[PDB]
């Protein structure tokens, strides 16, 4: 089997991407944030504290003939940005782009933090990291991908995120029309539960490539590119007037700037992030200070190849017995 679903930016900055997902019988369609940096599929629901729901579409398990309470199971998650959610668990039928999993754990939120409430466009998350990170207790649950894997034509999914435009998540096949040139594959460590890999270096603009190992994670659920302070300083030094602002919470730059590209290495291959992808617009409405899309990972504890990086590539998440990651230009 295979599946193919379009993923759409939630706003004009590509802050996140939403993908429609069918849950239950008859189908209830919710728009979920596919997150290769976590491993819980959780939704706003009929159980979510009323004051914490503001425009989201909710899953109502009592209206699904295939929903079953997973008795005694609870979940609770905290994300890198400080947001969180928690609740109880149902199993139900879940379909993405025509690919169906029966008996998927659907984690129903009883509580969500303010960031979730305030984002009316995101009805929940669908985790695509390794199932070892799943938070369900006392019986850990599998991701949608893990459950689908054996049925897939090939044990893979691909992320093809757009810049200010829709893109695609495919399951079970590689669309050879969706990228240019060849796909370069690179080793993955699953030791921390992430799609963790080592980039071979970077370049700023038309500058020379610096060969240096940068361990980090491929994370569709993180907006920006978070890299070591040395690398980030070298980038922003090429932008007149750019500076790190503790008050704003990172590097800012004059909105009048033209940003240089940023290249990262994948083995001997190179992925080029155009300068425009690194512009996250005014820090506050009407400001002439703009927020940068490359930020320091210092104090996160891990480097993160988030959407800024991934949307410059066609990315293969290969879940074969020994997982790997593939990157192609597009």
């Amino acid at each position: 089997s295979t599946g193919s679903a379009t993923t759409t930016p939630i706003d004009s900055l590509d802050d996140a991407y939403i993908t429609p997902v069918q849950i239950g019988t008859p189908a209830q369609t919710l728009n979920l944030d596919f997150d290769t940096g976590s491993s819980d599929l959780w939704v706003f629901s009929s159980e979510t504290t009323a004051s914490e729901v503001d425009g989201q579409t909710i899953y109502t398990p009592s209206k699904s003939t295939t929903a079953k309470l997973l008795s005694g199971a609870t979940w609770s998650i905290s994300y890198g940005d400080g947001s969180s959610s928690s609740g109880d668990v149902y199993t139900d039928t879940v379909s993405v782009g025509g690919l169906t999993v029966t008996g998927q754990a659907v984690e129903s939120a009883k509580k969500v933090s303010s960031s979730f409430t305030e984002d009316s466009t995101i009805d929940g998350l669908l985790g695509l990291a390794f199932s070892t990170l799943n938070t369900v207790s006392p019986t850990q649950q599998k991701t949608f991908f893990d459950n689908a894997k054996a049925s897939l034509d090939s044990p893979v999914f691909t992320a093809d995120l757009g810049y200010h435009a829709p893109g695609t998540y495919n399951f079970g096949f590689i669309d050879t029309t969706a990228y240019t040139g060849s796909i370069t594959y690179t080793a993955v460590s699953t030791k921390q539960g992430f799609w963790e890999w080592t980039s071979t270096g970077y370049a700023v603009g038309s500058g020379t490539f610096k060969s240096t190992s940068i361990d980090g994670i491929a994370d569709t659920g993180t907006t920006l590119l978070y890299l070591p302070a040395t690398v980030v300083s070298a980038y922003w030094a090429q932008v007149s007037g750019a500076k790190s602002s503790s008050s704003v919470g990172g590097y800012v730059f004059p909105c009048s700037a033209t940003l240089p590209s940023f290249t990262f290495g994948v083995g001997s291959a190179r992925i080029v992030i155009p300068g425009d992808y690194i512009d996250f617009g005014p820090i506050s409405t009407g400001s002439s200070s703009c927020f940068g899309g490359i930020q320091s990972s210092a104090g996160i504890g891990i480097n993160i190849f988030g959407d800024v990086a991934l949307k410059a590539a066609f990315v293969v998440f290969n879940g074969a017995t020994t997982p790997t990651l593939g990157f192609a230009s597009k």
Side-chain angles (χ1 to χ4, degrees), residues 1-62 64-67 69-109 112-141 143-148 150-190 192-242 244-330:
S1 61
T2 64
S4 182
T6 299
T7 193
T8 301
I10 66 167
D11 63 24
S12 65
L13 299 178
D14 298 347
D15 281 315
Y17 297 77
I18 50 172
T19 308
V21 178
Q22 283 71 50
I23 309 175
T25 308
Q28 299 180 39
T29 299
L30 274 66
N31 296 327
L32 305 187
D33 183 351
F34 282 24
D35 181 14
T36 64
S38 69
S39 306
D40 288 50
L41 191 176
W42 74 259
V43 297
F44 279 79
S45 75
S46 55
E47 302 179 330
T48 309
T49 303
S51 65
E52 296 178 350
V53 182
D54 188 4
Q56 295 80 10
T57 295
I58 64 167
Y59 169 58
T60 303
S62 67
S64 173
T65 59
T66 43
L69 180 72
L70 186 62
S71 183
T74 59
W75 63 279
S76 181
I77 194 163
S78 301
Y79 297 101
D81 69 353
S83 68
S84 64
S85 52
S86 62
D88 56 15
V89 188
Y90 292 83
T91 57
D92 209 339
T93 302
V94 173
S95 299
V96 176
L99 171 65
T100 301
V101 168
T102 57
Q104 175 64 45
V106 177
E107 302 172 35
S108 169
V112 304
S113 64
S114 59
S115 166
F116 288 115
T117 299
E118 291 162 3
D119 191 350
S120 66
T121 68
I122 292 175
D123 302 324
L125 267 64
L126 190 149
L128 292 168
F130 293 89
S131 293
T132 53
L133 294 180
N134 174 268
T135 77
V136 177
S137 178
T139 307
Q140 189 173 59
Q141 301 294 304
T143 70
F144 176 82
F145 178 52
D146 207 343
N147 283 322
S151 303
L152 295 177
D153 292 356
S154 181
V156 305
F157 68 91
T158 64
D160 181 9
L161 303 179
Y163 168 66
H164 295 349
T168 307
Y169 282 102
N170 290 330
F171 292 82
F173 73 106
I174 289 161
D175 180 357
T176 60
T177 72
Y179 60 88
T180 60
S182 52
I183 306 176
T184 298
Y185 290 86
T186 196
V188 164
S189 173
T190 63
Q192 294 190 84
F194 299 121
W195 294 91
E196 186 170 6
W197 65 290
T198 301
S199 172
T200 49
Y202 71 99
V204 176
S206 60
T208 60
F209 186 85
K210 177 68 170 183
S211 290
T212 185
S213 293
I214 305 170
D215 295 342
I217 66 167
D219 185 1
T220 58
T222 291
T223 313
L224 306 184
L225 174 53
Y226 294 88
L227 291 173
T230 48
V231 176
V232 175
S233 183
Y235 179 80
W236 289 109
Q238 296 305 309
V239 179
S240 298
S244 183
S245 168
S246 56
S247 59
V248 174
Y251 281 89
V252 297
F253 67 93
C255 294
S256 61
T258 301
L259 296 178
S261 64
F262 183 89
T263 301
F264 64 94
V266 182
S268 57
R270 307 288 181 253
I271 299 294
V272 181
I273 306 171
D276 293 344
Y277 290 25
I278 298 161
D279 177 19
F280 280 74
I283 61 171
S284 296
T285 305
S287 181
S288 71
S289 183
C290 276
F291 196 69
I294 296 178
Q295 296 294 345
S296 179
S297 63
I300 293 177
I302 199 159
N303 300 306
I304 308 172
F305 293 87
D307 299 332
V308 163
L310 303 181
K311 75 180 80 167
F314 177 86
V315 187
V316 181
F317 295 78
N318 171 28
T321 304
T322 299
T324 65
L325 273 173
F327 293 82
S329 294
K330 67 188 184 189

